[PDB]
Motif scaffolding. Structure first.
Motif, PDB file in Angstrom:
ATOM      1  N   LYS A   8       0.906  -1.154   0.075  1.00 42.21           N
ATOM      2  CA  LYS A   8      -0.094  -0.077  -0.103  1.00 42.21           C
ATOM      3  C   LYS A   8       0.799   1.082  -0.160  1.00 42.21           C
ATOM      4  CE  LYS A   8      -4.452   0.605   2.567  1.00 42.21           C
ATOM      5  NZ  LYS A   8      -4.807   1.530   1.442  1.00 42.21           N
ATOM      6  N   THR A   9       0.467   2.037  -0.826  1.00 43.01           N
ATOM      7  CA  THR A   9       1.487   3.261  -0.883  1.00 43.01           C
ATOM      8  C   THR A   9       0.684   4.367  -0.268  1.00 43.01           C
ATOM      9  OG1 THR A   9       0.631   4.351  -3.113  1.00 43.01           O
ATOM     10  CG2 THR A   9       2.636   2.819  -3.053  1.00 43.01           C
ATOM     11  N   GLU A  14      -2.994   0.365  -3.519  1.00 38.92           N
ATOM     12  CA  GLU A  14      -2.182  -1.128  -3.647  1.00 38.92           C
ATOM     13  C   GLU A  14      -1.915  -1.372  -4.846  1.00 38.92           C
ATOM     14  OE1 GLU A  14      -5.039  -3.576  -0.225  1.00 38.92           O
ATOM     15  OE2 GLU A  14      -4.882  -1.892   1.207  1.00 38.92           O
ATOM     16  N   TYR A  47       6.103  -3.623   7.929  1.00 39.08           N
ATOM     17  CA  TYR A  47       5.200  -4.281   8.279  1.00 39.08           C
ATOM     18  C   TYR A  47       4.695  -4.067   9.376  1.00 39.08           C
ATOM     19  CZ  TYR A  47       2.459  -8.760   7.896  1.00 39.08           C
ATOM     20  OH  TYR A  47       1.434  -9.690   8.421  1.00 39.08           O
ATOM     21  N   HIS A  70       3.457  -2.034   3.647  1.00 39.63           N
ATOM     22  CA  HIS A  70       3.058  -0.775   3.908  1.00 39.63           C
ATOM     23  C   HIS A  70       4.393  -0.129   3.183  1.00 39.63           C
ATOM     24  CE1 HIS A  70       0.015   0.009   5.594  1.00 39.63           C
ATOM     25  NE2 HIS A  70      -0.397   0.828   5.469  1.00 39.63           N
TER      26      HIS A  70
ATOM     27  N   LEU B 306       3.290   4.031  12.617  1.00 45.62           N
ATOM     28  CA  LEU B 306       3.260   3.484  10.971  1.00 45.62           C
ATOM     29  C   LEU B 306       2.467   4.973  11.072  1.00 45.62           C
ATOM     30  CD1 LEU B 306       2.615   2.660   7.847  1.00 45.62           C
ATOM     31  CD2 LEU B 306       0.908   1.091   9.262  1.00 45.62           C
ATOM     32  N   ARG B 310       3.900   8.250   8.159  1.00 45.85           N
ATOM     33  CA  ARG B 310       3.023   8.149   7.075  1.00 45.85           C
ATOM     34  C   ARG B 310       2.274   9.476   7.369  1.00 45.85           C
ATOM     35  NH1 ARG B 310       2.806   5.653   2.745  1.00 45.85           N
ATOM     36  NH2 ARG B 310       1.484   3.498   3.151  1.00 45.85           N
ATOM     37  N   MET B 341      -5.411   6.862   4.502  1.00 44.65           N
ATOM     38  CA  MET B 341      -4.517   5.995   5.335  1.00 44.65           C
ATOM     39  C   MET B 341      -5.290   6.132   6.453  1.00 44.65           C
ATOM     40  SD  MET B 341      -2.173   5.028   5.002  1.00 44.65           S
ATOM     41  CE  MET B 341      -2.524   4.403   2.742  1.00 44.65           C
TER      42      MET B 341
END
Ligand SMILES: [Zn+2]
Ligand SMILES: [Zn+2]
Ligand SMILES: [Zn+2]
Lengths: 78, 376, 86
Positions: A8-9, A14, A47, A70, B306, B310, B341
């Motif tokens: 997933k960016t 995805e 991850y 990710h 995470l 992001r 996200m």
């Protein structure tokens, strides 16, 4: 490719990839580049909040079935 | 330098506890090699991870009373407050030191208030519930009559002292020493309640095999804990002879099964100079905040890293495309780039902007305190 | 092949028990606030409002007894001079 995972960016896009549990992350970054223009150097795979090391395998990062990886680009990388 | 917010916490424990590193030094060095760390914390993502793994460590030391430098441990507190650590945290740890004292005075007293088990065979420790303990999830265990008969007797002792208070027994932290008449000799075992429970489940059937399923009935220990506790008794690390000889071997507790059979190893014994000791004493402890808890925060702490990642990335992404943007305009589109996200919260944002300002990624304009410029 | 306790280190967690009776003085749940702290605003006097226990075993608020010592120095229930317990 017995293990079908996905990356997933930032945009949420995805990407699906076929690999083997013995496949190294250094190679995933590659299979990611053949599918999207992103060069391995600007790739950071994440991850479970942990960063994957190039010289390691999906098996090491207990990656499985439809497991999501990710792709968070590098800041100093473009 | 050490970057991990955890490895950092693991070093303070290494220094404050009776380990090689701490005995191979002196209060000056130690106090020094400690003062150094709290300084580096000013440069660690979310200081809480350090607090978490630190408090946990202290508890171990405080309880098992194996702190190397009783002076620092205390002092360690203020320097911990001085550096900036949250409010409710510091004094909270302090409250912990206060209880071991309040407890010593209370143990010495209880012991005398009666001349179950011999006077100095039992040692009490009453700690504040808000300070100490964390995750509160009922954990069940069957206590052997000896211990069970003591609990109420202590329960009443605290009663004519400070009414309006109720003790809540902590079996995770409780520990003791139990004898172990084997076929080769008698030894002293240092253990946690759970282990005492598992072992004592043999007393009425000394030489019988007991399956994993039955131990679950004889001990009441939930499946998970049982697994760890048994493993802790068939695979204690750095131990020549194990105390419980299990059946179909495995490499992980996860592989155990109902049919798995366990028995008291009769060939147990220590060894000193390749000579089989007939009398010995070993430690088998080092427990935690119930396993289920471990998996809990990790699971979340990972997610946070995470989001942070992001958030961090999303900012420098907008910053890259545009070049000079205002906090205002940036806040709003920061929410759209992360559209698929998650919704970034303004605190997390604020923090990563700061983080990106020192690591020289973004810069504030002289002309406009707000409005950031994409540097280098 | 006994396993016998030889030394036990018991550990328990101190916690405020639940009281369900009322303050015979202000007639409010001992566990809640008193008639004072209830209305009277905040200040340097708006200090915590704990309960008190005596040698007679009765238990009123803390402020609801204080205001009952500058005068009648006996427990209003068992007329035996007031005496606290830690
Ligand atoms: Zn009252
Ligand atoms: Zn009050
Ligand atoms: Zn009274």
């Amino acid at each position: 490719g017995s293990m079908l995972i996905k990356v997933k960016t930032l945009t949420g896009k995805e990407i699906e990839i076929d690999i083997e549990p013995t496949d190294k992350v250094e190679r995933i970054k590659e299979r990611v580049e053949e599918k999207e223009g992103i060069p391995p150097q600007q790739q950071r795979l994440i991850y479970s909040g942990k960063q994957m090391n190039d010289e390691k395998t999906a098996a090491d990062y207990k990656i499985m079935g439809g497991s999501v990886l990710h792709l968070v680009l590098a800041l100093r990388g473009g | 330098e050490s970057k991990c917010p955890e490895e950092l916490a693991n070093y303070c424990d290494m220094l404050l506890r009776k380990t090689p590193l701490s005995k191979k030094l002196t209060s000056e060095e130690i106090e020094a090699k400690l003062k150094e760390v709290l300084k580096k914390l000013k440069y660690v993502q979310n200081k809480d991870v350090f607090m978490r793994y630190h408090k946990a460590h202290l508890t171990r030391r405080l309880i098992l009373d194996i702190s190397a430098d009783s002076e620092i441990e205390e002092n360690m507190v203020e320097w911990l407050r001085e550096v900036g650590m949250p409010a409710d945290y510091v004094n909270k740890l302090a409250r912990m030191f206060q209880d071991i004292k309040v407890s010593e005075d209370l143990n010495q007293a209880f012991k005398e208030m009666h001349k179950a088990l011999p006077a100095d065979s039992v040692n009490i420790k009453i700690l504040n519930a808000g300070a100490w303990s964390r995750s509160s999830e009922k954990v069940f265990v069957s206590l052997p009559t000896e211990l069970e008969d003591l609990i109420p007797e202590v329960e009443e002792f605290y009663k004519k002292n400070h009414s309006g208070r109720k003790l809540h027994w902590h079996h995770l932290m409780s520990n003791g020493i139990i004898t172990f008449k084997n076929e080769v000799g008698q030894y002293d075992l240092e253990v946690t309640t759970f282990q005492l429970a598992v072992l004592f489940a043999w007393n009425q059937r000394p030489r019988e095999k007991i399956s994993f399923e039955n131990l679950k009935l004889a001990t009441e220990l939930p499946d998970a804990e049982l697994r760890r506790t048994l493993w802790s008794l068939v695979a204690f690390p750095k131990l020549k002879r194990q105390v419980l000889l299990y059946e179909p071997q495995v490499n992980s507790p996860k592989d155990f099964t109902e049919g798995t059979l366990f028995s008291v190893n009769q060939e147990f014994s220590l060894i000193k100079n390749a000579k089989v000791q007939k009398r010995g004493k070993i430690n088998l402890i080092g427990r935690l905040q119930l396993t289920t808890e471990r998996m809990r925060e990790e699971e979340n702490e990972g997610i946070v890293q995470l989001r942070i990642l992001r958030t961090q990335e999303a900012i420098i992404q907008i910053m890259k495309m545009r070049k000079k943007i205002s906090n205002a305009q940036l806040q709003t589109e920061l929410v759209e780039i992360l559209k698929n996200m998650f919704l970034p919260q303004k605190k997390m944002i604020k923090e990563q902007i700061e983080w990106l300002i020192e690591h020289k990624y973004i810069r504030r304009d002289e002309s406009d305190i707000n409005t950031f410029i994409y540097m280098a | 092949k006994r396993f016998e306790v030889k030394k036990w280190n018991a550990v328990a967690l101190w916690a405020w028990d639940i009281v369900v009776d009322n303050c015979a003085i202000c007639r409010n749940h001992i566990m809640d606030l008193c008639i004072e702290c209830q209305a009277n605003q905040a200040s340097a006097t708006s200090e915590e409002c704990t309960v008190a226990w005596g040698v007679c075993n009765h238990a009123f608020h803390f402020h609801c007894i204080s205001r009952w010592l500058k005068t009648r120095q006996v427990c209003p229930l068992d007329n035996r001079e007031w005496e606290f317990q830690k």
